[PDB]
Amino acid sequence: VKLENILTIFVQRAKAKLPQGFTAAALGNWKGFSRRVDTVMEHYPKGLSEKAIKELRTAETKRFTDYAMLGPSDKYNLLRPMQGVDEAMIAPNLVSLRSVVCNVVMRSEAEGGGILLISSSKLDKQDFILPKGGLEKGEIAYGAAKREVLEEGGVKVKKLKELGVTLVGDKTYESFLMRSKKVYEQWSESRRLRVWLPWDDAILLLKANKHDEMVEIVKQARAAAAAK
């Protein structure tokens, strides 16, 4: 799994060999930075497809760079700041901050393919999951599932197929199969890493971290999409 160690020994050696105030671009052209991204990419399981391994690598990149430039990340304030985002690209959030809702967001092949998986808000943890939330008192489980992904994963989605209620341990899970409409450049938990992987790779990576409920939902929603 995770390693907050390398995050600290990266920012000590990156502070050292680099001019103070070093650019986003400056840290990247650095030679040791690429060596580290290599290091963690090994930790992912084998058999991961080419286009998936690429997709993850960009995420580690995002992680290490965000960690260098903005530090570590608390849970109350997961916003990574951005200049140069036309308002069309920013999630429209003036927010307010067991049962479980849970999404399988599909993107059109036109737009790229696969299904959204995201990082936990503990970004020194190397954990990729489905967008999953709980419900507010009185909230229809679909209005909740929509609300959660626009926040944790910053994507406007619209329901394809309701996958219905199922039971893991003490908890009832209601799952959806969804269509992304708009993907926002800036959303309220920007620090997290968004990856869109193919159906067979998502299954692999979620089983890799013992997320056995989410493998069944993915298998579930997968055959539903195929059904059309």
Side-chain angles (χ1 to χ4, degrees), residues 5-11 13-14 16-19 21-26 28 30 32-34 36-121 123-124 126-136 138-139 141-169 171-228:
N5 297 115
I6 297 89
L7 278 297
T8 67
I9 66 169
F10 159 82
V11 297
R13 198 96 53 81
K17 305 208 256 183
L18 296 176
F22 48 76
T23 309
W30 185 39
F33 165 51
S34 69
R36 290 182 137 76
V37 167
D38 304 331
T39 296
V40 296
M41 288 300 282
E42 319 298 298
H43 283 165
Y44 287 124
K46 61 183 175 67
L48 279 192
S49 80
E50 297 300 337
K51 65 182 294 181
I53 293 172
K54 180 273 176 186
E55 192 79 17
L56 298 166
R57 187 175 175 90
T58 306
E60 318 287 341
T61 293
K62 180 182 178 181
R63 158 189 277 142
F64 281 129
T65 291
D66 280 339
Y67 199 95
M69 306 275 318
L70 307 186
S73 50
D74 71 357
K75 277 77 170 176
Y76 295 89
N77 315 282
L78 292 167
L79 177 52
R80 183 265 287 270
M82 278 175 225
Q83 301 86 18
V85 290
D86 56 354
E87 290 184 354
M89 291 295 102
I90 60 174
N93 300 331
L94 277 295
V95 300
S96 300
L97 286 168
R98 274 320 283 281
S99 287
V100 174
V101 300
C102 195
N103 306 290
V104 189
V105 181
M106 301 194 298
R107 183 178 60 182
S108 44
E109 282 277 355
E111 292 289 330
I115 49 163
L116 177 54
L117 298 184
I118 62 176
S119 69
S120 65
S121 62
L123 286 84
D124 65 347
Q126 196 183 15
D127 208 28
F128 276 106
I129 60 168
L130 292 176
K132 89 190 188 169
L135 292 86
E136 283 173 355
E139 200 184 18
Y142 171 43
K146 280 192 324 201
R147 185 256 292 146
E148 173 277 349
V149 59
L150 182 58
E151 306 180 335
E152 300 200 351
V155 180
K156 202 195 197 222
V157 298
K158 177 264 293 178
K159 173 175 72 179
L160 293 184
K161 180 72 173 178
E162 295 177 349
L163 311 176
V165 184
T166 193
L167 296 176
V168 304
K171 276 180 276 169
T172 58
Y173 267 69
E174 187 161 344
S175 303
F176 298 77
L177 175 44
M178 293 196 143
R179 177 59 61 163
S180 65
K181 304 296 283 185
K182 177 148 201 171
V183 169
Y184 288 111
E185 277 178 23
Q186 170 67 320
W187 75 101
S188 62
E189 315 194 0
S190 286
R191 288 290 301 271
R192 322 185 170 233
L193 329 158
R194 296 194 303 203
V195 112
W196 301 87
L197 296 158
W199 286 105
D200 268 315
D201 288 340
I203 285 165
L204 190 69
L205 186 64
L206 292 170
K207 171 64 179 66
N209 303 302
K210 301 104 183 189
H211 296 289
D212 302 352
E213 76 292 12
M214 313 204 294
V215 164
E216 189 68 5
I217 296 172
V218 169
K219 280 179 181 179
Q220 273 294 316
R222 185 176 179 180
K228 295 182 288 295

